[PDB]
């Protein structure tokens, strides 16, 4: 039993159940984990304001939102880091305290009475953590808040402060009362300290128009709460170093390339499907295992939907994978000097950037589908490479029986696409007819291309409603 | 000031000096860090046997060097998890308490009266860190080693085993004797504890044949010892399961494939080279920073030198990287049906094999030169595509400005010998004439093969020379 404005601390040793014991009272109850699983690349009151319009009710405005979101950070004592992101063990961020102040600031938000943690002081120093309880304590007694937290082992100071402490042990309850006379109540039963020591060691020694209004609204902040993170990519170093090192090659090998040699032609249109095949699957492959924890844990909570979430992804993911594939076909374009005219420039562009989406597809769609990063991408490579063996330039004689692949592979599709926009059906050039007329024309190339985009974002999505 | 014989702690809060403050002295002297630097593969004897044999002098026979290893595992209880590998955090292996024993244990083979310990006790269980502290005090007293260890925070049980206690603040000594007579100094300084609490927590508040030989015998360890990590390294089925399916789908593309089309199967040979000439250099990029840290602190003992270890980490790789090929050339050849004969078939398993070498050379020279396994992999990246485009494949009118590329490129190498392996000179086939005869010799290219697998490695080793 726990009374309202009483500050009750788990205590026990690792394994001792502390974790497992831990709609209407769902909704003023605020859970917090020992993991802090936030987006790294946004900053404190961003994070903090992003959750507030994402958990707060509609009839509550954005203005008025925010300033709560801003007295909850500078009633947490985030204000001097509110100008710093989050970021994690790769991008440097927010201190550990810090980070578990935010984190407890995003169950905050909601204004919840009974504050369940688990594990808030493990694992930082013993000033951050004199603080966070010191913060905790505050809230319990001012603002009479129901707070139950389990902690590892707590310091001398720490373990003073709080007003009622429950025991555990190997799964079954030793004591449960306020911490200072839990020492009496064993010197009830006969366990004395031998030596000055803290009374917290011991007891570890002893133990219908409304729903799309706001399925647009979440959807359109949670484009607004990934830009940050598509931002990363957008101007990663090696990213960038990659795609313009690419796009110099392309340039410098092909340099005013000729229309009479079809196989150079041939073979830079194959190397670009298969450079703009690779590189957007396997990016993508990466984000869905990796931010699979947090999409789980939002979503236990109920403060956005798989649909708007989905949705919200692939908007802030299309700027990104379409802004360097547009810069690489210019360059690459004006460099070699590929069929001349505005409008077939248009048409390329538009058929890379339709073909990349697709991989980018297909790419998410084998990481929703697998749950293991490093599998996904292991998959991912695996059918790229059987697609580009497959796309109509390494092979020209397809076994009869086996055909069927090369129809469902998208850079061959691509590679088509890119033959067609470049030399037409073969008029001026008239192994020619198999190599640039092809099988498949221009307008089923393409609608088979946005079908098979289409069908990954549909099976990825699929995929994470299985889960 | 510390005595034989006693245990001495230093304590401090995160930044006031531990860590800083902690040629026969020194090779008495066994300092041991907070990482536990080890490999994840060997088992808890297997390296304590081999830096057994890698540290004591050759005077010290084989049978019972591992007779005194056996003797200092059952001294440090690990006993009961010897026949378990260490493991890290990616692959399961013992607990943090069994790893850092078996740290302790890795300066313990030499026998050191002076033992320094910077921060083992931090980051562990109550449990776990209680024993740990037991049998250092048992070391410390029955043995007579002269211990100076430091701890972020100490239990009590714990805290009340050191005979000596340093204290630390922003860098300067606060109390210097015993811990228990801290609490009466601190007391009669005019500070005494308003609570029950542990004294511990008390004090952070306020705070020429010869030689050969040796090589021979080092190189044939350490070589030994890789065998271990080189074992696992790639044998995942993230690597080995991409490789059969890319071995089944490039034998069923091409099968029976015909030697009229010129086209299909110099295409086929271009793959080939391109999917052997990323894959090792890119496992090759991945094992140096891996392995940097560890190298570092072994190499600061003089334990070995470091031409004998990379001769074994390069001889391991070559054990390593040289069965998969073989197995993909195995099943490619017969289900392709390429050229007839035994002779043929040896001479391009014996031209992928050193084509595969020198792209390990490149991909360890590029990890070397760059401290960065991220941009060390990128680099790797963009050279392995600019050898590809210039392997004569796809750019058949390389532009005179930058045609050097296609002579030092390595893919290009691999395509020529291969196709002269396949056709010859093109006197069954007689375009033939670039596609086929080109202007680079068997033997030269066999020749400049060799000359830049030999090349990577030196670079590679110069690179170490450096740091
Ligand atoms: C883009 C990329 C990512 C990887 O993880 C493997 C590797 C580095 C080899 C690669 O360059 C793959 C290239 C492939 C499949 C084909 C090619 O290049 O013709």
């Not at 699979?292 to 979503?299: D, L, Q, V």
């Not at 692939?314 to 690489?328: D, I, Q, R, W």
Request: charged share 15%; hydrophobic share 50%; net charge positive.
């Amino acid at each position: 039993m726990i009374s309202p404005g009483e500050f009750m601390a788990v205590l026990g040793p690792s394994g001792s159940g502390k974790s497992t014991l831990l709609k209407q009272t769902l909704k003023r109850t605020g859970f917090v984990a020992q993991d802090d699983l936030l987006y790294p690349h946004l900053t404190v009151r961003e994070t903090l304001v992003f959750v507030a319009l994402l958990r707060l009710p509609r009839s509550l405005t954005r203005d008025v939102k925010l300033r709560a979101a801003e007295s909850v950070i500078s009633e947490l004592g985030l204000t001097k880091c509110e100008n710093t992101v989050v970021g994690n063990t790769f991008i440097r961020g927010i201190s550990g305290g810090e980070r578990k102040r935010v984190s407890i600031a995003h169950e905050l938000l909601i204004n919840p009475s009974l504050l369940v943690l688990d594990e808030p002081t493990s694992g930082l120093d013993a000033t951050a953590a004199l603080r966070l309880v010191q913060t905790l304590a505050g809230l319990a007694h001012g603002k009479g808040k129901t707070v139950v937290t389990s902690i590892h082992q707590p310091s001398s100071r720490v373990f003073q402060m709080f007003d009622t402490v429950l025991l555990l042990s190997e799964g079954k309850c030793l004591f449960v009362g306020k911490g200072r006379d839990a020492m009496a109540y064993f010197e009830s039963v006969g366990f004395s300290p031998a030596f000055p020591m803290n009374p917290a060691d011991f007891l570890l020694d002893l133990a219908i128009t409304t729903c799309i209004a706001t399925w647009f609204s979440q959807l359109c902040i949670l484009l607004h709460r990934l830009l940050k993170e598509r931002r990363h990519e957008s101007f990663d170093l090696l990213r960038i170093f990659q795609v313009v090192a690419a796009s110099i090659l392309c340039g410098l090998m092909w340099w005013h390339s000729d229309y009479r040699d079809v196989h150079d032609r041939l073979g830079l249109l194959f190397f670009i499907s298969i450079f703009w095949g690779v590189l957007p699957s396997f990016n993508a492959v990466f984000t869905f295992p990796q931010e699979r924890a947090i999409f789980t844990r939002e979503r236990a909570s109920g403060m956005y939907t798989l649909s708007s979430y989905f949705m919200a992804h692939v908007l802030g993911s299309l700027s990104m994978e379409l802004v360097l594939p547009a810069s690489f076909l210019t360059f690459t374009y004006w460099m070699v000097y590929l069929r001349p005219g505005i409008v077939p420039f248009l048409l390329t562009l538009s058929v890379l950037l339709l073909y990349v989406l697709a991989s980018q597809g297909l790419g998410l769609a084998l990481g929703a589908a697998i749950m293991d990063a490093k599998k996904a991408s292991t998959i991912v490579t695996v059918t790229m490479l059987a697609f580009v063996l497959t796309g109509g330039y390494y092979v020209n004689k397809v076994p009869s029986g086996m055909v069927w692949m090369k129809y469902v592979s998208t850079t061959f599709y691509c590679y088509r696409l890119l033959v067609a926009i470049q030399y037409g059906s073969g008029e001026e050039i008239l192994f020619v007819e198999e190599e640039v007329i092809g099988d498949v024309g221009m307008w089923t190339s393409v609608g088979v291309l946005f079908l098979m985009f289409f069908g990954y974002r549909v099976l990825a999505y699929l995929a994470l409603r299985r889960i």
